[PDB]
Amino acid sequence: AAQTNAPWGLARISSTSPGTSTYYYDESAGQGSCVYVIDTGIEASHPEFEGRAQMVKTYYYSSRDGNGHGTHCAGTVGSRTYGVAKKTQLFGVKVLDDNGSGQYSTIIAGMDFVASDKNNRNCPKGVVASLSLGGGYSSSVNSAAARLQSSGVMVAVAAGNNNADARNYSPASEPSVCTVGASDRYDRRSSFSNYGSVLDIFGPGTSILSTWIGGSTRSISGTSMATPHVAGLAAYLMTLGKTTAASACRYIADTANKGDLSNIPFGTVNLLAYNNYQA
Numbered sequence: 001a002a003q004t005n006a007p008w009g010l011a012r013i014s015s016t017s018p019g020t021s022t023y024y025y026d027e028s029a030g031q032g033s034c035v036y037v038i039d040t041g042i043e044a045s046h047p048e049f050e051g052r053a054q055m056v057k058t059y060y061y062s063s064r065d066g067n068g069h070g071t072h073c074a075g076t077v078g079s080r081t082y083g084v085a086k087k088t089q090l091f092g093v094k095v096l097d098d099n100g101s102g103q104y105s106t107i108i109a110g111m112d113f114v115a116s117d118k119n120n121r122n123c124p125k126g127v128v129a130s131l132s133l134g135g136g137y138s139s140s141v142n143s144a145a146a147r148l149q150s151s152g153v154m155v156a157v158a159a160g161n162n163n164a165d166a167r168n169y170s171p172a173s174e175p176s177v178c179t180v181g182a183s184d185r186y187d188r189r190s191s192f193s194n195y196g197s198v199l200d201i202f203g204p205g206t207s208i209l210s211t212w213i214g215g216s217t218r219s220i221s222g223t224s225m226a227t228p229h230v231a232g233l234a235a236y237l238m239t240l241g242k243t244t245a246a247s248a249c250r251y252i253a254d255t256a257n258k259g260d261l262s263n264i265p266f267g268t269v270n271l272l273a274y275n276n277y278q279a
């Protein structure tokens with residue numbers, strides 16, 4: 001398939017070069033795979049989701065995304081126009097309130113919920129998790145990301161929007177999950193994007209156009225906008241049968257666009273997420 005006039009982030013994961021605006025992908029599009037979005041919630045009634053999105057857990061008075069952050073990220077994973085895996089199943093886990101904040105224990109409880117709830121869902125192509133959140137370092141927020149990875153779910157986490165080493169931030173500093181940086185349309189590291197030897201891949205994170213609450217759309221920047229690119233890509237890659245949850249982050253970094261990004265600090269990986277699709 002080929003989506004014309006797609007967002008630049010989608011075309012860039014199907015392009016060996018920047019400056020294009022066409023997204024190419026196998027027509028499978030993550031049919032049979034599942035991606036949990038552990039954020040502020042997903043507006044499941046958005047027409048862009050085509051009834052493929054639904055809220056499975058909340059830790060507050062409502063599972064409604066009164067923020068819009070989780071709705072944007074879910075639209076980048078698998079919506080029809082702004083999504084990578086346009087046929088996946090989207091599950092919402094609201095661990096952050098409508099201000100985008102939440103207690104570490106609420107986040108830890110959400111990661112444990114996904115490692116069990118995947119046995120309540122039908123995902124014959126595997127389970128993906130996108131954690132577009134983060135705070136300071138915590139060995140207990142790290143160990144729970146590793147538990148979610150060990151259960152059988154690919155865990156993709158934002159590197160952080162601090163312009164620093166992601167070693168002082170969780171769960172970005174967990175070595176078994178997949179730490180994702182951000183880039184812009186000119187193949188440069190986002191001025192806010194974190195770096196370090198813990199990063200495993202870079203995704204489109206600057207000026208990302210996706211769904212928004214109220215049935216609307218908007219463009220926002222952040223490493224939390226490049227994680228759903230990799231989370232959706234893996235669901236796409238697992239549906240084709242190229243890789244598994246445990247080896248997705250190693251496969252994505254093996255088929256990536258090597259050495260194309262500028263302003264990558266020394267010792268940080270220069271790899272851009274690439275779907276390797278040949279039409």
